[PDB]
Design a protein around this ligand. Structure first.
Ligand SMILES: O=C(O)CNC(=O)C(=O)O
Ligand SMILES: [Mg+2]
Ligand code: NI
Ligand SMILES: [Zn+2]
Length: 331
């Protein structure tokens, strides 16, 4: 078996190997990359996502989210308080202010220490889940706005034709902005490109061990667990590397820098934070190996997680039994 210790693998495709997305994903998996739950892909040196970022200040963040923490430094929840709209210009100015800017630090490890020590005492503002793309339409390789759709994958694998579309989202981050422990909707893959700015640190649990993370989460967030049988779909819970180590949960960590792709694999729980002002673009995607994960994915039926138009059809076709009660939570 390849990659038995489930380490995060880093790939360096040539421009030749960067032409066929599906085939390169299948290659990574042949080398065991999926066992980690997360891979890094460094694009060929000749590739660019777009010519410059010079005019991005006019993008609107219509609902910035202030991420308010509760609990203890290593085990906390975050609530998203909706703020007034601001442009990317305004946001970047805010991120760079004395109140929100990245503190002095020696290296990524010192900054990671400061993050876990101090995250709870600040409420950074996250511009998340903004429908859009920053790839130039003339970028033909690994353009997250031109991937084949999950609906088309299901059609090609399973023969069923469903409604729905699949488009990317932009994320504008600042120091301490945080993504809580989650797998993707319907345990899909995701791919994330860091377009510009400061790094993003990731933590991930191997898919084969995801249930161990869930068991810990139920113990650490006991009332959440009683309220919903898939409360990690709410994307509010954080657990530090220290706490994961104390409880024997297998995980890995890696820092993504501007110009790099990360791919999360089905049922690979991940969480992380931003080092400073940045802009990422991400989208979900499917392969043939995903299909069974889609059939087995947990669902939030308490009604908090409240998910897309397109996810309806996935649940309808892959999880017909659930479909009924899941849509009671979604209506
Ligand atoms: O970048 C972020 O804030 C969150 N991204 C993801 O969870 C992902 O790409 O799967
Ligand atoms: Mg603009
Ligand atoms: Ni994700
Ligand atoms: Zn729920």
């Amino acid at each position: 078996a390849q990659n038995p210790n489930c380490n995060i693998m880093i790939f360096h495709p040539t421009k030749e190997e960067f032409n066929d997305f599906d085939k390169y994903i299948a290659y990574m998996e042949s080398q065991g990359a999926h066992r980690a739950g997360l891979a890094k892909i460094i694009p060929p040196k000749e590739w660019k996502a777009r010519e410059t970022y010079d005019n991005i200040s006019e993008i609107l963040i219509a609902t910035p989210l202030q991420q308010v923490a509760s609990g203890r430094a290593g085990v906390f929840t975050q609530y998203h308080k909706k703020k007034k709209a601001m442009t990317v210009g305004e946001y970047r100015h805010l991120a760079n202010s004395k109140k929100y800017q990245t503190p002095p630090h020696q290296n990524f490890e010192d900054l990671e220490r400061k993050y876990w020590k101090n995250r709870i005492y600040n409420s950074p503002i996250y511009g998340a889940d903004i429908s859009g793309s920053l790839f130039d339409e003339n970028t033909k390789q690994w353009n997250l706005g031109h991937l084949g759709t999950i609906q088309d994958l299901l059609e090609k694998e399973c023969g069923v034709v469903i409604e729905g579309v699949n488009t990317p989202y932009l994320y504008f981050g600042m120091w301490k902005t945080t993504f809580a422990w989650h797998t993707e909707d319907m345990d899909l893959y995701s791919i994330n490109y860091l377009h510009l700015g400061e790094p993003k640190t990731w933590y991930v649990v191997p898919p084969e061990h995801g249930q161990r993370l869930e068991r810990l989460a139920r113990e650490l967030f006991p009332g959440s667990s009683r309220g919903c049988g898939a409360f990690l779909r709410h994307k509010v819970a954080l657990i530090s590397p220290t706490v994961l180590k104390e409880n024997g949960i297998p995980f890995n960590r890696i820092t993504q820098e501007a110009g790099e792709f990360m791919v999360t694999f089905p049922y690979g729980y991940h969480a992380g934070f931003n080092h400073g002002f940045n802009c990422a673009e991400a989208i979900n995607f499917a392969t043939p190996r995903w299909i069974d994960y889609g059939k087995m994915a947990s669902q939030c039926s308490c009604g908090e997680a409240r998910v897309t138009f397109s996810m309806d059809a996935f649940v309808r076709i892959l999880q017909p039994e659930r479909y009924d009660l899941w849509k009671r939570g979604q209506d």
